[PDB]
Ligand binder design. Structure first.
Ligand code: ZN
Lengths: 392, 615
DNA sequence: GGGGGGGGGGGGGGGGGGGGGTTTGGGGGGGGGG
DNA sequence: CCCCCCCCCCACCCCCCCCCCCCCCCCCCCCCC
């Protein structure tokens, strides 16, 4: 029964070596596939009788003299040459699994393990996967042995064109689908109705530029960040960012190393992941000059540019923008132009298809309407309003 | 003398010792039957016994001093006698461990000296540089392809044995004497866990103008991961030299000393100089009897931090955070956060940090800080690992953040995800994922320059943005009031503290640093355990439902706050409304009440109005 | 007068022995705040 | 517009190899048929 139990990585002790255990964790890194020799085939130059060496370790030493009876009986010291055509290779790949961040005891470093996977089971894993893996827990030559898990079986943790008619036949689907966008958020149905059109999109023709963009602006709060996150959930090919957030690969692209090792690579930011899709910029007012010129290049070329380390290149970034320009100094002055309240230049704002300024006005009547909605959602736990027909 | 001759006498003498003190035999059988029962129905205890050096002294002083001074000759026969005893019990090597009265062999990494080599020693210290656990090969088993026999080989190094034996150099044999090829058998082959830990001297003991010394303990199998970095520990083991020490002819420089170690026999963490509590019928009765009284929200909160002058509303708010609000997953699993977050702005020297101590020692699953999650790397890692910050570690727990004004930009930018989404997102090295960080936070902060200016906002006295400060449900400002009654009280407490004279010291005698190693011979306010048991019982027994009369008080108070002059102090908004719902729910959890009702909202709104507006 | 056998030189194989295999400070460039 | 900050960049076993020794083979010379 022991193979059935999913062990966390730090429960894998030395006594398990040789057993077909099952482990649980997150894959923090994955190798590119490379071939490994099962059997080397050598041709013999002076007799043509091939010979074979099987390999059963991380290293080997190649053969030199023809050991075959064809040469050996003739005492003919022929020379051996490796053939990749005739050698049997197997696909090899390595992945580093780490215990889940929740499993780490208080103060300990998260423990990790090498998984080796061979044959057709290769490229069943990817970084960020949370997964259960069966394998043989094994030593390797470094008395302290190196150790790894030989993977054997994997459990990842994670018609339509007829089925659309079920909603079409019910009618008024635009109004209802817009009302299905974040039903837990009060009112603002005209804004939701526009935000839906950004997912649906216009025409691109030849060029004619087809993406649709909206800026929300004005006082902080009013469930706006949740609305942007909800759009990222609802929409296909969506991504959520902030003007300073997503601070790893970033919203703005660059050439990069993997400084944990020594190689270099070019990789895209969020605006490339949002390609053929939609990007949501929270804290939009706070993004820097490189970020602003990045969204400029989305709107002006539908690309993001590279000009570094001898590489000049533009990466494709066809994408809708949803944006949230919350003002300076904590609150908008609700009778002024936005440029007296917002950091961003009006040039950038002019490229958006629509801009919605919304103010968090204290007004007893609208306060009670909003508060009745919020308190009802908290009280009832279901159907954030009636007759909205919230589609999943 | 040749040890092998007297080995039998030492075995039978330790067997007589084991018979004389039968509690060791009883412990051996207790371990065996526990392991048998865990095997019987699909946890395992180790083959280790802690023997008292006092018992062994009273039995045979000559054998006892042999164990202390010559463990390389006296431990192996004693462990052989123990193994024979365990084998004599009905249906693998057993190990010894030691406790008590080491005398001159009670040491620290400073006073551990070359005179002590190969003696049994106890070292008082602090753990640093815990290595990764590695499996160490000690027996390799091999099926012979044609011969049929299972050949094997045992292995030796300077750490696996208490006495010197020729090292066996880490090679698997692959051929029989007859030349037949061998296939190595994992599982049947035996590997022991192996770990190195660097015990540092306690810095309190280190004398004037000296760095703390340190030494490497070696730990095998069931002693591995007994401790983590920073643990104050007492280790017992044999102090040893190893290696060639530059006597080997490669080394022109022979001034280098020999490497030295302790081979560990036991690891005692010194936690003392309940995370989930037991509950007796007395506790069940008195918890429920107390819950029917009205002033519990005063008495329980005032039982927090009883040394603190004033700050009743702060203690009440702390109690509501400890009994925080209920989670709301709506339809489609749409998540809204029930947890509560608090921030104590103010002067230094106020109650803040001491309140964080009292909260930290009262709460459970509580993390001390002075964040989020990260992708990280270190000196020896040729690899990157995903790390948990305090909020991830406090998932469904609490975080205590002192000096929160000091936190750096990459942290503060990502705190928004904790505050809005109760989660944190990773965005580099292809680990694009999101982690649960569903905690209730209490933070404290100081002015960045000068004393706190009570006219200026928290956004102005401290560099933290208003768009960050506004995330917290409750935002207190505390200040060092110069009240003579308070000052008289705390002054006399501090004077009584500084008049303390330790036991048996003469008047004016200086306190000696020698202490802990020299003694290394091994108004109805409630108790904090009772308060813990009450909050545990509340979390254990109720999830209050939200009644409409509560809603009517809540919308009344929110729309009042959002249209009274309180608007001129703060732009009161939707976050304040859901905060009122959380705080009223928390007060229902104070009551243990099956529902939230109008009474809870009336308390919560008074506290929130005080916290934000001071009234 | 040619072929076998004896004796000496030269080359190749096999064995044995031996050696090698990250922190701290400083200047200059580049960007941001008063 | 000017100055300060902060960021970057840089300093014991096993294999290959070589040396030494011994045997075997091949050629030359002399004798026998
Ligand atoms: Zn050949």
């Amino acid at each position: 029964a022991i193979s059935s139990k999913p062990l966390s990585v730090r429960q894998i002790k030395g006594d398990f070596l040789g057993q077909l255990i099952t482990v649980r964790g997150i894959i923090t890194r994955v190798s590119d596939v490379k071939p490994a020799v099962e059997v080397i085939a050598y041709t013999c130059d002076q007799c043509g009788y091939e010979v074979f060496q099987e390999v059963n370790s991380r290293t080997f030493t190649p053969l030199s003299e023809c050991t075959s009876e064809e040469c050996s009986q003739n005492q003919t010291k022929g020379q051996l040459f490796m053939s990749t055509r005739a050698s049997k290779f197997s696909a090899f790949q390595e992945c580093k699994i780490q215990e889940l961040s929740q499993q780490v005891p208080v103060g300990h470093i998260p423990r990790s393990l090498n998984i080796h996977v061979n044959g057709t089971l290769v490229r069943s894993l990817s970084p960020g996967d949370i997964v259960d893996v069966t394998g043989i827990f094994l030593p390797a030559p470094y008395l302290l042995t190196e150790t790894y898990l030989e993977a054997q079986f994997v459990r990842q943790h994670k018609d339509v064109e007829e089925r659309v008619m079920e909603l079409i036949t019910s009618g008024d689907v635009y109004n209802r689908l817009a009302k299905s966008i974040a039903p837990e958020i009060y009112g603002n149905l005209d804004v939701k109705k526009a935000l839906l059109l950004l997912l649906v999109g216009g025409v691109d023709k030849r060029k004619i530029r087809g993406d649709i963009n909206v800026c929300l602006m004005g006082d902080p709060g009013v469930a706006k960040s949740q609305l942007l996150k909800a759009i990222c959930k609802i929409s296909p090919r969506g991504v959520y960012t902030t003007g300073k957030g997503s601070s790893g690969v970033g919203l703005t692209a660059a050439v990069m190393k993997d400084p944990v090792t020594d190689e270099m690579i070019l990789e895209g930011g969020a605006l490339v992941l949002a390609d053929n899709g939609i990007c949501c910029i929270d804290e939009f007012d706070k993004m820097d000059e490189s970020d602003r010129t990045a969204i400029h290049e989305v709107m002006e070329q539908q690309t993001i540019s590279i000009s570094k380390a001898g590489i000049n290149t533009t990466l494709n970034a066809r994408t809708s923008i949803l944006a949230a320009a919350n003002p300076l100094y904590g609150r908008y002055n609700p009778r002024l132009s936005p440029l007296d309240n917002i950091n961003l230049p009006a040039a950038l704002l002019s490229r958006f298809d629509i801009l919605f300024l919304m103010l968090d006005i204290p007004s007893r009547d609208d306060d009670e309407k909003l508060a009745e909605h919020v308190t009802y959602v908290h009280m009832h736990n279901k159907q954030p309003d009636l007759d909205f027909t919230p589609v999943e | 003398f040749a040890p092998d001759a007297v080995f039998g006498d030492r075995v039978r003498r330790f067997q007589e010792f084991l018979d004389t003190f039968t509690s060791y035999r009883d412990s051996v059988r207790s371990i065996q039957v526990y392991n048998s029962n865990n095997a019987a129905n699909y946890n395992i205890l180790p083959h280790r016994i802690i023997i008292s050096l006092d018992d062994l002294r009273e039995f045979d002083r000559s054998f006892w001093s042999g164990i202390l001074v010559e463990p390389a000759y006296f431990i192996p026969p004693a462990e052989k006698a123990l193994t024979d005893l365990a084998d004599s019990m009905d249906d693998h090597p057993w190990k010894l461990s030691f406790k008590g009265s080491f005398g001159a062999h009670a040491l620290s990494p400073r006073t551990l000296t070359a005179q002590h080599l190969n003696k049994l020693v106890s070292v008082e210290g602090i753990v640093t540089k815990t290595s990764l656990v590695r499996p160490k090969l000690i027996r390799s088993v091999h099926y012979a392809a044609k011969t049929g026999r299972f050949h094997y080989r045992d292995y030796t190094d300077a750490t696996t044995t208490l006495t010197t034996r020729i090292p066996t150099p880490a090679i698997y044999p692959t051929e029989d004497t007859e030349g037949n090829k061998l296939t190595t058998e994992y599982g049947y082959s035996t590997f022991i866990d192996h770990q190195r830990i660097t015990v540092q001297e306690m810095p309190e003991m280190a004398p004037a103008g000296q760095l703390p010394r340190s030494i490497d303990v070696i730990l095998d199998d069931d002693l591995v991961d007994k401790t983590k970095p920073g643990d104050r520990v007492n280790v017992v083991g044999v102090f040893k030299s190893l290696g060639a020490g530059g006597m080997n002819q490669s080394n022109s420089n022979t001034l280098i000393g020999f490497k030295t170690l302790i081979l560990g026999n036991t690891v005692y963490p010194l936690h003392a100089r309940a995370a989930r509590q037991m509950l007796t019928d007395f506790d069940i009765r008195n918890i429920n009897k107390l819950s029917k009284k009205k002033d519990i929200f005063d008495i329980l909160s005032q039982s927090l931090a009883p040394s603190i002058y004033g700050h009743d509303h702060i203690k009440k708010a702390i109690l509501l955070m400890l009994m925080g609000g209920v989670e709301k997953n709506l339809e489609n699993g749409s998540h809204l956060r029930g947890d509560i977050n608090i921030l104590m702005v103010g002067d230094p020297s106020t109650a803040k940090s001491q309140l964080l101590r009292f909260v930290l020692n009262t709460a459970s699953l509580a993390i001390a800080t002075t964040l989020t999650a990260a992708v990280t790397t270190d000196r020896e890692t040729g690899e990157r690992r995903l790390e948990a910050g305090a909020m991830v570690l406090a998932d469904r727990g609490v975080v205590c953040i002192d000096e929160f004004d000091k936190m750096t930009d990459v942290d503060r930018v990502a705190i928004h995800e904790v505050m809005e989404q109760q989660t944190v997102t990773i965005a580099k090295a292809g680990i694009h994922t999101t982690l649960n960080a569903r905690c209730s936070v209490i933070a404290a902060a100081n002015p960045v320059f000068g004393q706190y200016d009570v006219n200026r906002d928290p956004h102005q006295n401290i560099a933290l943005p208003d768009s960050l400060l506004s995330r917290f449900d409750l935002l207190f400002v505390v200040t060092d009031d110069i009240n003579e009654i308070r000052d008289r009280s705390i002054s006399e407490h501090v004077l009584r503290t500084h008049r303390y004279l330790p036991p048996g010291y003469l008047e004016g005698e200086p306190v000696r640093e020698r202490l802990n190693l020299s003694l290394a011979v091994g108004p109805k306010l409630v108790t904090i355990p009772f308060l813990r048991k009450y909050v545990q019982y509340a979390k254990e027994r109720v999830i209050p439902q939200l009644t409409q009369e509560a809603i009517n008080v809540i919308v009344k108070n929110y729309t009042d706050l959002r249209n009274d002059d309180n608007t001129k102090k703060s732009p009161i908004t939707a976050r304040t409304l859901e905060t009122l719902i959380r705080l009223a729910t928390a007060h229902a959890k104070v009551r243990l009440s099956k529902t939230v009702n109008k009474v809870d909202a009336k308390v919560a709104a008074n506290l929130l109005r005080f916290a934000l507006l001071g009234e």
